[PDB]
Amino acid sequence: DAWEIPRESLRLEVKLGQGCFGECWMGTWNGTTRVAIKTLKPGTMSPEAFLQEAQVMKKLRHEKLVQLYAVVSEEPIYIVTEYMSKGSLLDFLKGEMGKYLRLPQLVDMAAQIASGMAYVERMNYVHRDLRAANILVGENLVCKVADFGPIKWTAPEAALYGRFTIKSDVWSFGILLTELTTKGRVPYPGMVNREVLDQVERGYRMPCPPECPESLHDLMCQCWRKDPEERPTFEYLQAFLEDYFTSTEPQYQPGENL
Ligand SMILES: *C(c1c(C#Cc2cc(NC(=O)c3cccc(C(F)(F)F)c3)ccc2C)c2cncnc2n1CCOC)[C@@H](C#N)C(=O)NC
Numbered sequence: 342d343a344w345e346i347p348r349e350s351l352r353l354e355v356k357l358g359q360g361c362f363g364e365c366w367m368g369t370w371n372g373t374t375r376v377a378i379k380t381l382k383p384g385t386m387s388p389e390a391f392l393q394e395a396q397v398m399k400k401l402r403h404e405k406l407v408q409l410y411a412v413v414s415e416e417p418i419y420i421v422t423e424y425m426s427k428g429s430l431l432d433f434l435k436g437e438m439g440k441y442l443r444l445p446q447l448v449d450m451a452a453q454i455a456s457g458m459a460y461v462e463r464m465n466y467v468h469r470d471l472r473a474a475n476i477l478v479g480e481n482l483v484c485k486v487a488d489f490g491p492i493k494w495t496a497p498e499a500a501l502y503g504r505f506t507i508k509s510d511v512w513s514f515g516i517l518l519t520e521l522t523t524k525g526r527v528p529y530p531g532m533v534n535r536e537v538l539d540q541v542e543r544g545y546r547m548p549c550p551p552e553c554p555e556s557l558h559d560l561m562c563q564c565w566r567k568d569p570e571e572r573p574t575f576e577y578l579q580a581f582l583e584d585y586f587t588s589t590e591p592q593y594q595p596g597e598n599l
Contacts, residue, residue, distance in 0.1 A: 405457025430476035434525030459575035508569035515564020
């Protein structure tokens with residue numbers, strides 16, 4: 342494999358997140374270039390299964406996807422991507438860093454995520470796990486799509502019958518629109534996973550947030566139609582939020598929170 346790397350090239354400087362899947366670290370590869378690294382706990386999971394993740398990352402390059410730099414096929418395993426300076430989007434929004442992110446900033450992010458997903462769309466691949474916990478931010482509020490390793494953020498047909506399409510990713514993206522607009526709170530407040538599947542299949546969807554323009558709530562409701570083929574594309578979503586403040590909501594003025 343030409344992606345492969347000799348083990349002596351990686352300083353694993355600082356630790357970041359642990360778990361039953363392994364762990365990930367901030368570090369320095371090749372002396373020069375700073376990088377993120379994901380390990381594997383040899384006891385908990387298998388090599389050929391955990392390495393099918395990298396397989397996918399190999400065949401995907403796009404400026405709004407996290408870039409796999411390198412791999413290490415022997416335990417302890419190391420999948421090695423670029424490093425993103427500002428951590429998870431979830432952490433960013435709840436964080437003091439995003440006490441002051443007004444709609445303008447938030448909608449641009451959604452546009453960059455969208456573009457990247459519109460790429461995934463173009464490549465006939467499927468994420469199965471789109472939510473602010475798997476979006477990374479870097480300098481200038483660049484956002485990128487990741488995948489580390491359930492039901493509020495995924496569409497019914499997927500949760501139930503396992504029909505995980507790109508249209509399951511559109512739904513969740515709609516739910517991600519609620520994270521960006523709430524400063525990274527959880528969806529379905531005072532609701533728990535089994536009460537969610539009822540209300541949703543019964544037809545319950547979330548209301549337009551405080552001070553979030555209804556244009557965005559309608560977009561979410563396009564994201565969350567039950568008939569999947571009549572949810573919109575990431576091609577359309579991208580162009581939509583790209584033009585949001587010129588074409589859809591140019592009246593817009595800020596306020597307390599958005
Ligand atoms: C730790 C972490 C990282 C990182 C990383 C990382 C991610 C991935 N996964 C992908 O990006 C991916 C896999 C499959 C498919 C796709 C698709 F299709 F969407 F493109 C993407 C593989 C390997 C690695 C190393 C990271 C990077 N920069 C800054 N901080 C980072 N952190 C810390 C997280 O914030 C606290 C992350 C992982 N992995 C983790 O374990 N979180 C708990």
